Amino acid sequence: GPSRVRQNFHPDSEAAINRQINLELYASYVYLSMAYYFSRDDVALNNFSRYFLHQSREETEHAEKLMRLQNQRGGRIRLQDIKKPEQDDWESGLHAMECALLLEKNVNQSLLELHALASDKGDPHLCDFLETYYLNEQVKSIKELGDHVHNLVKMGAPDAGLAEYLFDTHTLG
Template sequence: MSSYFAQDDVSLPGLAAYYKVASDEEREHAIKFINYQIKRGGKVQIECIRAPPTNNWENALKSLEVSLALEKRKSDSHLTKYLEDEFLEEQVQAIKELGDYVTQIKRAGPQGIGRIFI
């Protein structure tokens, strides 16, 4: 998503920066999960991550709605304590932030007046 919004024909650098930070954060989470698995004596098996369903996010609102849906994913009950300790507050903040952005863009209307990421 970051690279899409950084393209010269889209040019929403604030949104590109937001998604870059989010991507870096998710990578840090993956490393924490790897370290957690190793601590528990498990074997880390890296598999391919599916590409997003599209490379054309159409507009800021659509991308934020997709991001919000991904942030609301369900958790694994076996990792509940670990997830709560490591990620819950951050997850709640991400859901709030994305929800606010969706609301603000909807409020701005189809012309995008007052976009928050410019």
């Protein structure tokens, strides 16, 4: 017996949504890691720290919106371990921005696969949800990180002593 709410909601979509929830929580955790890297006494770039912390909290919102969608559609949320980030030392402002950019493109590819699946299962509600709340948000994030990486590289990060310091103060400040 399915949910009395469930309608036109494919089991494969339910499962893909649970995989997406894990990926969003993972991304939250990556950014939380980055945030506290920047507030080390031997790094001390407070606006990089604030930036990544804000990203971490936004990833939690992305996760919750998918958990709500699961409930709305009569799916059942199935949580899995949240894997720790690949690094605990993020090396530099530039390196963390580059890692974030790769992570955002990977999440985007996941969301595009999810939309393709929704399209295959004739679920326009799911397609619209991803278009309204996920796809443009990812385009905006990737473009912003691309901008940041570009500026840091041009400024001489990470080796030029003033580069990360000034970018912290001006762009992220």
